[model samples]
Target: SCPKDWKPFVSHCYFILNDSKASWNESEEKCSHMGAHLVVIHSQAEQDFITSNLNTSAGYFIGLLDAGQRQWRWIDQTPYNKSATFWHKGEPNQDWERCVIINHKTTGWGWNDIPCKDEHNSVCQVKK
Candidate 1:
């Protein structure tokens, strides 16, 4: 069962922290405090579900980050599976910026890499 106030999706419990802005690291820490990790969208269906819940006016940090050498890693160490890619076209456009966010809306809420230091909303997930 999901925790109180958490939304259930598939086998996970998800919670969106849209009430306040937090940097990628800060958001990740917050999720840790809640016994979850920042979100890791695994499939088009998952993104479809998650993105539909976001507000276009804001960006939300996800668990995926450029860990170096173009090696993107999830907070939970899930192996990167490229097939479900939903990057905003021409995005991940820079290497120096290592974090990712969604709900840009211009690109239909596709993933866009940005600097980890920039504060934003974030989604969290853990086993249901």
Candidate 2:
């Protein structure tokens, strides 16, 4: 079961913002206000589920960031595993592109590192 307007998956509840767009940090703040945080994808199944439900030509902010540490980390403070990550071709390629977004335009719905200030739709998740 999930909260009203949230979708249940595994042990979490997810809310995808379809009509609204915000910068990465703004998206995080909005999620926090909703009693959740940006979505942290842990596996291909989760990625597939999210991408399948998203707008195919738009990008959506997730919870991954390099944060100038040169190491990807989730907003939930979970450690990011490189082998489990789904980066698009030639991604995480620049230091200034710190925030991660699921690129719907890419095949396999891969991830792309982009500037945090760019606005995009987002997904929020909370443990059930």
Candidate 3:
């Protein structure tokens, strides 16, 4: 069973950190401290569920990042498939923008690449 305030989804429990904002790295650390990690989105259904529950005015950091050498890797080291990605149009336009956020301002709640230091709300997940 999931702890209080955590929503069970599939085999994992998710927690949305809306009470405060943190940098991407800080967010990841917070999740780790909670015995979890930043949310690693792998499907449209999962993304949709997260977006629907998000505060529409704020962006949320995920676990995806550019790991150099033309590779985008999840913090858990999951393989990132380009066709399975959900980037917003013109997004990831700059190589220097390594961290990923789900921008609520976008129509599709699309993903955007921004500096990792920019603070944002975060979503954390832990296996059941």
For residues 6-36, write the lDDT of model 2, one tens digit per residue: 8888898889986778999899999899999
Tell me the TM-score of model 3: 0.94
TM-score of 1: 0.93
lDDT values for all models: 0.86, 0.86, 0.88
Residue pairs with clashing backbones, model 1: none
Estimate candidate 1's alpha-carbon lDDT, on a 0 to 1 scale.
0.86
Q: For candidate 2, give the lDDT.
A: 0.86
Ten residues in a row with the worst lDDT in model 2?
Answer: 100-109
* TM-score of each model, paired residue for residue: 0.93, 0.92, 0.94
Models sorted by TM-score, best on top: 3, 1, 2
Give the deviation of candidate 1 from the true structure as CA RMSD: 1.2
Better of 1 and 2 by lDDT: 1
Assess the local accuracy of residue 26 in candidate 1 as a C-alpha lDDT between 0 and 100.
89
lDDT of 3 by residue, 74-101 (tens): 9998778888888888778756778999
